Give the backbone structure.
Amino acid sequence: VLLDPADEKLLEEEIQRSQQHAKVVPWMRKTEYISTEFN
Amino acid sequence: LNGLTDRDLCELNECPLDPGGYFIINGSEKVLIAQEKMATNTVYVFAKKDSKYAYTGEC
């Protein structure tokens, strides 16, 4: 049986947006949690 | 507690974040507040108004 990925994508009707949480910004950073071992 | 690891401090029921630097006297954490003073061995010249002295070289 034949199953091309180009045919696999045409089986769906519409599945395929923004990523603006990830944007690099020098006045903003990330976060830090509680490990068990540290300094 | 000197150099003692976080594991061991927790085993001692101590806090690895606790800074130290205080005494325990009869169970009370007592800090010695750093007391400011005039520097020793150093000459200082002051004018003390309301006195017979125009200038005073303290040491």
User: Anything to note?
Assistant: Residues 5-8 of chain A form the longest helix (4 residues). The two ends of chain A are 60 Å apart (CA to CA). DSSP finds one helix and no strands in chain A.
